Amino acid sequence: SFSLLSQITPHQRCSFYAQVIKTWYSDKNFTLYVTDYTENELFFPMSPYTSSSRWRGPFGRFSIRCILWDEHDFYCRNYIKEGDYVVMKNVRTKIDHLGYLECILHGDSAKRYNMSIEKVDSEEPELNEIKSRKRLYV
DNA sequence: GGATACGGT
């Protein structure tokens, strides 16, 4: 069962459609910042007043950090791009050291949790409400 | 397992 990002809470597993806003690779993991243009009180409030950021929106509490480890990292690092639409299935949520929600994909070689992320074609109607909502904020 | 909304590798 799919949730809107407004609906997700810490320390569960969930699934959602989203757009990728920001990527960052490192030698430990791959990070996505993603949104479905719904608000969550535990999301970081992104400021439009920061000087010099490459972030162009959405602002306020509208996006979530996803940390991708191991096979998820290796698969996505050079594949998932800023602007892409994704569907993410059976991922874990937690709270960071400051009280903010984030999503995690741990390594799962034993294939216990059936986690996945894959690209979604821009034309898929599953993305329609994301698109409809994004019009509110541009 | 990383470590704060940047950095744009």
Side-chain angles (χ1 to χ4, degrees):
Chain A
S1 79
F2 290 101
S3 295
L4 295 174
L5 289 185
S6 59
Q7 288 161 4
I8 70 166
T9 54
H11 309 129
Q12 64 180 20
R13 251 163 218 291
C14 61
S15 310
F16 53 84
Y17 298 89
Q19 196 169 18
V20 187
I21 301 298
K22 172 187 177 75
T23 63
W24 187 257
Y25 61 84
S26 86
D27 44 36
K28 306 308 186 260
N29 55 42
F30 189 57
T31 307
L32 307 182
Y33 294 79
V34 313
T35 184
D36 70 357
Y37 293 101
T38 67
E39 187 265 357
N40 192 304
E41 53 171 15
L42 301 174
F43 291 0
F44 188 89
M46 289 299 292
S47 170
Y49 312 130
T50 309
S51 41
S52 88
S53 163
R54 299 288 296 277
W55 192 277
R56 295 288 178 289
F59 300 102
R61 300 184 189 273
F62 270 94
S63 310
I64 179 139
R65 180 160 67 225
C66 313
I67 313 261
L68 279 57
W69 301 100
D70 310 307
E71 68 264 21
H72 321 283
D73 173 6
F74 309 144
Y75 178 49
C76 290
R77 298 173 75 61
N78 315 108
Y79 178 54
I80 303 302
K81 308 298 180 197
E82 312 190 340
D84 286 351
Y85 298 97
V86 292
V87 60
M88 306 175 56
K89 291 183 179 155
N90 293 328
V91 308
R92 273 303 280 202
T93 65
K94 68 186 248 151
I95 294 284
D96 70 14
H97 291 289
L98 290 180
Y100 299 107
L101 251 186
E102 54 183 24
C103 146
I104 317 286
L105 293 75
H106 297 277
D108 190 21
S109 294
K111 278 162 183 203
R112 164 64 183 84
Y113 297 114
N114 191 28
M115 275 183 303
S116 65
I117 186 167
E118 299 269 22
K119 246 175 236 205
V120 178
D121 194 88
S122 33
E123 284 317 296
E124 281 318 308
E126 274 88 357
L127 309 171
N128 280 347
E129 299 262 346
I130 294 188
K131 293 187 193 193
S132 144
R133 288 194 294 271
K134 190 206 159 123
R135 303 200 290 258
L136 296 175
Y137 297 107
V138 297

